[PDB]
Symmetry: D5
Subunit: 62 residues, 10 copies
């Protein structure tokens, strides 16, 4: 398990987390809860872009 | 489920995620990768603060 | 490779899931004694969550 | 899942929680953390006594 | 890492889950002889639970 | 989507894993009294395994 | 921390779950050839279960006592 | 939510894991007769894998194309 | 764990992945997404064939 | 309760773990033919990852905007 492997693991986890945030926002009729989850999902998408950048830098094949 | 239970689940997951980020920062010998994981850990702790706030708002018994 | 803060986070995550279970089981019971047993368990677990959040804040500057 | 089944599940989870609290108390070097976990283990053991009693009453 | 008390707790937790499974299977069974089989197994496992609690209280003052 | 035979097989499989656990925990030792407790649990579980195999045999004509 | 008898018990437990899966898949199929494929697999796994029980009995005298 | 081909793929995947377990147990075993029991089980599970690959190729023309 | 066992693990994972891709193709709304998943399934079937060949040659 | 973008995210996450497995199995192998086999599988999976990230960007404007 090297650095690129840990980056891939973090990216995979972030993608699943976004899925969870979107599903939980959809399940709520509370506007404040939906806003909470939409903000979290946006911050997680930022993290995804950052991880993909690090992966492309560190992985030649990617 | 209901909203409070899903918030509790989100908080539990975020706490495990911080553990992972900090562990990966420790495991790396590349300083850039270490810094990446430390930055991720800091922002996830902010997410934890937000979630605890939501829980306190929505759970009278917790606040 | 875990430190004290990682173990506190794990305990807190487990407690949040435990509260979910207690409140669900309190709801699913129609026996007042059992519903009440589970409600008392959930209140005590919420107390544990507050204590663990305090520990986390006291040992983690990023939090 | 009836009431007695849910109590058995809670009791089993409480027993694993005690094991985890005691292991984490053993593993910590900060004394305050270490006592935090010991306090949690004592409280959970009291929970176990209550659950055993409830199980005896209903079963 | 584990000591005798921790192993006894694990055994007790497992026995409790086992009783739940035996009782659920008795409820779901069609053949009344199979139902009787699962009911008997549940009763014997409950006796084991009593014994495990006794051990745990002999070896743990708290 | 489980029938009676499938539940018997699940119970038998669980009992076999339980015996493994009792034997490993007896080996872990530390206290003779704890070892004897785990050994007694293992012996009674073996009784259950035999009865479950016989059940399976009457109910499963392909197994018998 | 496994000895030979524990590995035998583990194989037997896995085989029993596998038979459950084969019988369930045979029931869930509408193609008769696929149904028959799963039923044949189930019968062969049951033969393996018999062999595993014989091995367990030969290695575990306390278990053999109940047969 | 599963068709027959997906159930065949699941059975094949499980058989492959089962072979791994049997070969590992054969390597770990001390009694030569237990070692041989596990080797016997591994050889017969490999035969099942061959049979299931043939079934999958018969049911999945896209898979058969690559053989 | 030896080379043949790792090949078996890869093959078992690839078979589960094909199941997932076909399910997602059935479930998808957008035609391009359906086609994306079906194309992934086809490529994975090629990977399955390669792994079976390797396994037959080495075992 | 899954939409197309969620299924894309799930496939991408699975491919990333698959690449990890292929690379670790290449490292753990002593037979050069097996090692090259696993490296080849990893390269092809990485191409799959590029395709999926492109699909994700097209389906998720919030992700496209980074
Ligand atoms: Ca995450
Ligand atoms: Ca998270
Ligand atoms: Ca807890
Ligand atoms: Ca607990
Ligand atoms: Ca048990
Ligand atoms: Ca058992
Ligand atoms: Ca099997
Ligand atoms: Ca198998
Ligand atoms: Ca795959
Ligand atoms: Ca994959
Ligand atoms: Fe994150
Ligand atoms: Fe997050
Ligand atoms: Fe950021
Ligand atoms: Fe952030
Ligand atoms: Fe607690
Ligand atoms: Fe509790
Ligand atoms: Fe308490
Ligand atoms: Fe028992
Ligand atoms: Fe039993
Ligand atoms: Fe008994
Ligand atoms: Fe009996
Ligand atoms: Fe056979
Ligand atoms: Fe077999
Ligand atoms: Fe055979
Ligand atoms: Fe088989
Ligand atoms: Fe692949
Ligand atoms: Fe490809
Ligand atoms: Fe793929
Ligand atoms: Fe392509």
């Amino acid at each position: 398990l090297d650095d690129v492997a840990r980056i891939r693991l973090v990216l995979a986890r972030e993608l699943e987390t976004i899925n969870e945030y979107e599903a939980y926002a959809r399940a709520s009729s509370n506007p404040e809860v939906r806003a909470f989850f939409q903000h979290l999902a946006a911050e997680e998408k930022e993290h995804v872009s950052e991880a993909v950048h690090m992966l492309r830098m560190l992985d030649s094949g990617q």
